[PDB]
Amino acid sequence: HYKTNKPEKDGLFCERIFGPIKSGICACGNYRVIGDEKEDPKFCEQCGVEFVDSRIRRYQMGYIKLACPVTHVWYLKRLPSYIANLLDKPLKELEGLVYCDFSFARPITKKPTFLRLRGLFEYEIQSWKYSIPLFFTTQGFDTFRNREISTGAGAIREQLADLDLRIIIENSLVEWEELGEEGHTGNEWEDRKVGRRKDFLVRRVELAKHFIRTNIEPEWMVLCLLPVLPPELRPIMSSDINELYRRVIYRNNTLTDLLTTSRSTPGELVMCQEKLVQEAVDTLLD
Amino acid sequence: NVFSPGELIGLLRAERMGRALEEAICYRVVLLGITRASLNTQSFISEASFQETARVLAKAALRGRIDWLKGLKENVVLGGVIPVGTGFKG
Amino acid sequence: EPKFRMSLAELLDESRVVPLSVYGDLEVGISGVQHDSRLVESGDLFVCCVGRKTDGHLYLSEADKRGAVAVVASKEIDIEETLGCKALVIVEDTNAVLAVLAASFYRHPSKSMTLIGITGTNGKTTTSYLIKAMYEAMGLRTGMLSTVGYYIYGDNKLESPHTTPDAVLVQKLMAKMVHNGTEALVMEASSHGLALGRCDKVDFDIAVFTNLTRDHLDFHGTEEEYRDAKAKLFARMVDPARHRKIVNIDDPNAAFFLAQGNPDVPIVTFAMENKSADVHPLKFQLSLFETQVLVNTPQGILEISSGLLGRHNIYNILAAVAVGIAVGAPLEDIVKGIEEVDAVPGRCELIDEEQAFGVIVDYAHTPDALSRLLDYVRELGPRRVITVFGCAGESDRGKRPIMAKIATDKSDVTILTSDNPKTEDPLDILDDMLAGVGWSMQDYLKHGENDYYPPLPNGHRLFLHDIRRVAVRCAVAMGEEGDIVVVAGKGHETYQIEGDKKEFFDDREECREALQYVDELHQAGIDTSEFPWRLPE
DNA sequence: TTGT
DNA sequence: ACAACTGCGATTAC
């Protein structure tokens, strides 16, 4: 709080969501003793803060709901890209679709698709879409656009979700068996390209085989919700952790405001704010 | 199905698999430098988290590795009795 | 002014309502007594309702729970425990109580003004409205009740959940209409409504059948039961040279029903091929817009009504011509009836009036109706026929394999989409539907991944989508000059329920908007010849 | 930087 | 892209 030194409600240091700042004291102003013989309410009706020792602030976590999904920096932007390994699409295409406004034609392969674009990277939205949205009911257009061309962070999640690891390992084994017949006979450049492709295929096979039997889903590589560290661990004197947290919170609430304002809002503004949110998440993580 | 190209296995394990399996296993000796060796261990928290922490952490997280604390630094990080000397139950 | 002669004990006593056990008198104020508990209101006497589903005791219990003043039952009923008036009367006869539920003055007006009953297997509602329009053009205002809406008298129709409303409530509404706002109260019910007892407890001036066949065979348990019930109801109240027996002579049930009853009633046949009926089209003007025929009969009118169907609509027009000529011998009075028949009513709605290919809406919720409508459209259809329909979630799934095959057989291009999910996965029922033609959802999708979408071995193309709106839009955008599109999901319904949520967006206006806006997609360059649409770049 |  | 001795103590500047 301003010139009060008190935790703000529904904030980074909020007492309600994390816990009380003092042992036995609460934000409502009435002290209580935990474990007393007399019946005592665990939490004040007036104030959400529970009556407990303030050690919880050390071990208690939080989470910010994100309107637009974000992609983990470790999986995407490392030189070995697990996302680019699973999705045979090149790394440059994914980095563009994440950071530079582009479009992916078919992000879902398990649902019916009327449009026959079937393209990897759509460098522009100049394709006729205004006549298509007016023709169909506008609500209907919204309903199918997800199976249609998607942008930013929905295509990656739909590709990771709608995917058959068995088909992936089958196709990779087939391509491995095909390659290597006479590649070594060629030049050093061609042999190097064949070798790199073969190594990429082997890594893809290994990743898919591990994903099959590890009770872990590749869907979780793109973060729908971001956890928040316990308050005590980032105590405000103020830390950068918390500065980046405030930045991503501000960008996310601005994005949510723009989304909830009206559907007729310009796509450029919400897309730029999505890029800003994803860059803030990247700076926070790594 | 048993092994993939480019993998690293143990010499005794490779010989025992070659004796048992008719499937041709082509393996050649790679002398591994001290650093490389550490980065390739059974524990992702003791020897893998010494030079490239984030890389091995992301790899173990995506794989879902399970580490059995049979090493010293593993119990050191966990804050428990190290299975050395008086910590070895016999 | 809901009813009259139902707010006094003497009125019920004069109606031969003998319950053998009563407390005090029916001093409670009630506009019209209703046998059904739902039709009755609080503080109103409710007589016992006779029915297979609800007996007299259950009806009396429901009336006492709803707050009816009087409840009739075989045993002692404690109606005064949760009612506004302590006076009640328990009648041990359920049928007699249901008959006496309608007031004497209420039942006398509807029986004296006029009455026209039309109970047919197929094409009954098409002839009922035609007869109503003919009677209105004759100079007497009247209403015809249908399965969709209960209309005792008047142009307006009150909302009713069941196909046939309560007899007492229908009589009360007919009396209220005949008191002011209606000159005649004709009670028309289908075969099931006539067999239940809705139109049976009413003096019918004219009781003709549009199509006599096996109706309610699974419910009644015996063939020709509805026809026998209609004949008995007509013989109960019959007058000389007043009842009309206009029906197709080819149907044996029609002749069996005409044989029963008073022989002094006028009998006539509306068959076209039969020479004894003297009716015949004698014209070749069949078309999707209007099918005019020059009927040459001594009793029937010269001009005929423009029907959308080839044989069903023609038979309905021929059956209605007799009722139109019975009132007036001049054929000029049948112009309004012909216009109302060509007005494209609810059932099997005609094509839109916009400049475009044929787009028809049909209620093909059964395989037999779907195949019949497809044959009717193939008869008229000069070119490719496109159909779009869906099954119902939790409906009999036995229907699903056959229908898809029946559609793929006749139609060259078939688009399947989920008309009513009804708490079942849309893709889950589409797979069961495609199982009839031999395909699975995994294949379709794999074929779908391919641009090819290989055509059925018979040479027809099958297409699948999960959203009904986009499917209807693609079907209405994929058309030729002579090609026709047929929507068979909901002919006379505009409610779409996916799970718990219910939406009313589905309507014919959605299809008309597609025909209106297809010009933009055509100018832009989108290709709708196949389901994988080619787009620029 | 130095080398990996 | 990654890493390059181990710790301790003092000050001033934020």
From Swiss-Prot, chain B:
Location(s) in or outside the cell: Plastid, Chloroplast
Disulfide bridge positions per record: none
Domain of life: Eukaryota
Protein family according to the UniProt entry: Belongs to the RNA polymerase beta' chain family. RpoC2 subfamily.
Function: DNA-dependent RNA polymerase catalyzes the transcription of DNA into RNA using the four ribonucleoside triphosphates as substrates.
Quaternary structure and partners: In plastids the minimal PEP RNA polymerase catalytic core is composed of four subunits: alpha, beta, beta', and beta''. When a (nuclear-encoded) sigma factor is associated with the core the holoenzyme is formed, which can initiate transcription.
Protein name: DNA-directed RNA polymerase subunit beta''
Protein's gene: rpoC2
Full protein stretch here: 1245 to 1334 of 1392
